[PDB]
Design an enzyme around this catalytic site. Structure first.
Site, PDB file in Angstrom:
ATOM      1  N   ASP A   1       0.861  -1.168   0.000  1.00 36.69           N
ATOM      2  CA  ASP A   1       0.000   0.000   0.000  1.00 36.69           C
ATOM      3  C   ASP A   1       0.898   1.220   0.000  1.00 36.69           C
ATOM      4  OD1 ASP A   1       0.904   0.631   2.525  1.00 36.69           O
ATOM      5  OD2 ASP A   1      -1.050   0.540   3.497  1.00 36.69           O
TER       6      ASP A   1
ATOM      7  N   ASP B   1       1.112   5.013   2.132  1.00 36.84           N
ATOM      8  CA  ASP B   1       0.658   5.705   3.322  1.00 36.84           C
ATOM      9  C   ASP B   1       1.039   7.184   3.248  1.00 36.84           C
ATOM     10  OD1 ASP B   1       0.104   3.044   4.688  1.00 36.84           O
ATOM     11  OD2 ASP B   1       2.230   2.793   4.166  1.00 36.84           O
TER      12      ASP B   1
ATOM     13  N   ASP C   1      -3.607   4.570   2.386  1.00 30.47           N
ATOM     14  CA  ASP C   1      -4.035   5.046   3.682  1.00 30.47           C
ATOM     15  C   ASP C   1      -3.746   6.543   3.763  1.00 30.47           C
ATOM     16  OD1 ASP C   1      -4.736   2.495   4.460  1.00 30.47           O
ATOM     17  OD2 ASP C   1      -2.759   2.039   5.263  1.00 30.47           O
TER      18      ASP C   1
END
Ligand SMILES: [Cl-]
Ligand SMILES: [Mg+2]
Ligand SMILES: [Mg+2]
Ligand code: NA
Length: 329
Positions: free
Chosen positions: A194, A196, A253
């Site tokens: 992912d 962030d 995120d």
DNA sequence: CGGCATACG
DNA sequence: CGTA
DNA sequence: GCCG
């Protein structure tokens, strides 16, 4: 020679004991799938100790005196040194329980508890789950639909174009607000599962209400494949990332913090997960101070430590500063 | 033996 | 419960 | 599973 807490020693991203640490991390992961958080922590800590060593472990004697190496972790290393494999590790690897729990917990929206319940019900594959959509939350449905894309690593070369798209929406939501790359990419990783980002504004209080405004703008741009609000300060999303002639889904995120808390949020969200757990454990158990991503509290004086930098936080804990690249515990 | 990070959605 |  |  080796301190007991991971936050007391540099841990680089690449090191000299890769195979040994990977084996211990299989045992840690399997302990988590059985709900044994203490065993998970010990195996993770032992693996991390090896990551921090300056050269390869070649002989069992080199483990004497190292923290977190007792009978079980030493035997794992011994077997790898003598035979190149550890029977316990290989038995875990091939086990139906481990393979299914790993597959199910990789789904966004599924944790150990849900995965274990599905396992006990007899479910084993992603297609088993798709055939029973009544038992899935909307989040899990999104995680299942996007699972293939989300299983492929994000490249650091993708992160920069994504940061620019987030910065454009953030600038419209609140001019002057900034976007900082955190997580594993800030620690030097060339890939990740992912991306962030941490968002703030230099004027304390201006960040209030910001994240809904950012999310609405990203959604209006057509970039959000899933988010939970399609007031809040963290959002765990699935984003559309361009690819040659097409696109792929990526986990992103987004976090907002007031600038007074920015050093604490930056520290927390930069990880690694083990590094932060060890740092919070050290803070409380060795220094009597309570650390989270919002601040550092002295429970005797009932006061919060102001910090203007991550360097300030390490100093207030009596620790030598570690840059993000040395927080790969 | 107790303890194992500490939050938000 | 999930997420970090 | 290991530390203190
Ligand atoms: Cl345990
Ligand atoms: Mg990440
Ligand atoms: Mg993340
Ligand atoms: Na999951």
């Amino acid at each position: 020679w080796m301190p007991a807490y991971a936050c007391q020693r540099p841990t680089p991203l690449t090191h000299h004991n890769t195979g040994l640490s990977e084996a211990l991390e299989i045992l840690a992961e399997a302990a988590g799938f059985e709900g044994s958080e203490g065993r998970l922590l010990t195996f993770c800590r032992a693996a991390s100790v090896l990551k921090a060593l300056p050269s390869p472990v070649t002989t069992l004697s080199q483990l004497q005196g190292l923290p977190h190496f007792g009978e079980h972790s030493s035997r794992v290393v011994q077997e790898l040194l003598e035979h190149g494999v550890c029977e316990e590790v290989e038995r875990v690897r091939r086990s139906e329980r481990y393979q299914t729990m790993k597959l199910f917990t990789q789904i966004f929206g599924v944790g150990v508890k849900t995965a274990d319940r599905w396992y006990r019900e007899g479910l084993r594959t992603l297609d088993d789950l798709r055939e029973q959509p009544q038992k899935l939350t909307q989040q899990q449905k999104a995680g299942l639909q996007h699972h293939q894309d989300l299983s492929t690593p994000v490249l650091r070369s993708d992160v920069d174009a994504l940061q620019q798209v987030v910065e454009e929406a953030v600038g419209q939501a609140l001019p002057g607000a900034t976007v900082t790359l955190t997580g594993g990419f800030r620690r030097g990783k060339l890939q990740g599962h992912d991306v962030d980002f941490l968002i703030t504004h230099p004027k304390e209080g201006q960040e209030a209400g910001l994240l809904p405004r950012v999310m609405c703008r990203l959604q209006d741009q057509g970039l959000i494949l899933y988010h939970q609000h399609q007031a809040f300060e963290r959002s765990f999303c699935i984003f559309r990332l361009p690819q040659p002639g097409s696109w792929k889904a990526v986990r992103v995120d987004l976090v907002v913090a007031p600038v007074s808390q920015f050093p604490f949020a930056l520290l927390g969200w930069t990880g690694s997960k083990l590094f932060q757990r060890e740092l919070r454990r050290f803070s409380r158990k060795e220094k009597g101070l309570w650390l989270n991503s919002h601040g550092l509290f002295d429970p005797e004086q009932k006061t919060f430590f102001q910090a203007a930098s991550e360097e300030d936080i390490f100093r207030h804990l009596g620790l030598e500063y570690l840059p993000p690249e040395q927080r790969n515990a």
